């Protein structure tokens, strides 16, 4: 940030990153997120259906959200946070990490070339008014029902 003594606080409305969502039932949703956060955290705080998130984002030390990805990271753990990103934003995202691609292509449900794991996305300024679709994600284990 950048502030001077005596200045007033900025508005949360001006700092909101907007995410546009097509549901599993074909309906449209609008979600508020913030920079420095993962897409999974915003989606779960806003209670968006269609994501299972069995592993709840992965480990806590060497994560996929750090801007340079650490070599000895383990990557995503469940591949159950998939979303489909529209063309401009997905093109700006870039090529997939090899571990993320391995987890994406190994899922039990069909995927696409625009598929992307939500917990592997760090929300940025240029993601404002980004369009995504969330078809329902697969279940994995017995405890998913609990």
């Amino acid at each position: 940030h950048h502030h001077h003594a005596g200045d007033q606080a900025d508005r949360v409305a001006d700092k909101i990153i907007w995410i546009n969502i097509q549901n599993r039932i074909g309906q449209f949703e609008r979600i508020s997120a913030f920079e420095g956060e993962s897409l999974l955290e915003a989606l779960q705080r806003n209670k968006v259906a269609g994501i299972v998130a069995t592993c709840e984002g992965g480990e806590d030390i060497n994560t996929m959200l750090e801007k340079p990805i650490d070599p000895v990271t383990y990557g995503p753990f469940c591949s159950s946070c998939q979303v489909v990103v529209s063309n401009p934003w997905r093109n700006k995202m870039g090529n997939l990490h090899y571990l993320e691609e391995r987890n994406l292509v190994r899922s039990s449900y069909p995927t696409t070339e625009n598929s992307r794991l939500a917990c592997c996305i760090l929300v940025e300024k240029w993601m404002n008014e980004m369009i995504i679709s969330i078809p329902q994600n697969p279940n994995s284990v017995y405890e998913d029902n609990m």
Partner: protein
Amino acid sequence: AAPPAAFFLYFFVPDNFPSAQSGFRTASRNPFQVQFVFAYDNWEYKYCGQWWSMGSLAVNVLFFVVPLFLWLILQTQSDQSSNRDDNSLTFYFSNAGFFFFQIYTNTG
């Protein structure tokens, strides 16, 4: 060159107790210096067989074959020791298992 924007930084375990010696005054770090600090640890090879020709092929081969050279030189000098009846390269057994300065006493 522009200063780096993304690079590996220092990291600490959760709930780490900070070091507070000499008044606990920490300065901002230099991106180039931190980049150099963490570059070598994270450096890796790109393709199979890249190491052999990386730098000097002859020098790398010589470094690779160093242990064999040492073994061969030791073998030659063992040949020299054998005919001169010098100390050979063997595990000498002359104390019959008695240790260097060991207390050997009995009870009763």
